[model samples]
Target: AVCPTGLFSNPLCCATNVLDLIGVDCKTPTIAVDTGAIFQAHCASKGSKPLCCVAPVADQALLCQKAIGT
Candidate 1:
């Protein structure tokens, strides 16, 4: 996830966003993630406000870990 570092005191902290999530280098990282099933379902679940990249929560973080190849 990626957010404006100015707002956060701790660099390790995490946050969320809605639209701007399609691709970024958060603690994890967002790639070209676009699929069917539901249009923008995942993005909409996040938010519709200011930014896109933010910190990953438990579930998202787990997915991030999974993205990392051992």
Candidate 2:
């Protein structure tokens, strides 16, 4: 079934914050840790491949978010 005339013309966007992006409960928090770095970093330790620390943060180097990842 199709939506009513004007209703279908313009749809509304429900914006949410990062906190709300996850599950309703926050007890079991999950992290999207950098896999690219970890995968190579672990292998290189055993002299398998080259690896570099992809540090998103550094000495006194902080990033601010004007708007949360939506």
Per-residue lDDT of candidate 2, residues 5-69 (tens digit)? 33122111111112332111111102232343543343334333211111222112111111111
| lDDT score, candidate 2 | 0.22
**TM-score winner:** 2
Q: Which tens-of-lDDT digit does each residue in 8-36 have in candidate 1?
A: 21121123432423322223223333332
* Model 1: residues with Cα > 4 Å off, grouped in runs: 1-39, 49-70
Q: In model 1, what lDDT does residue 44 have? A: 40
* Ten residues in sequence with the least summed lDDT for candidate 2: 21-30
Tell me how far candidate 2 lies from the true structure as C-alpha RMSD in angstroms.
18.3
Scored by CA lDDT, what does every candidate get? 0.27, 0.22
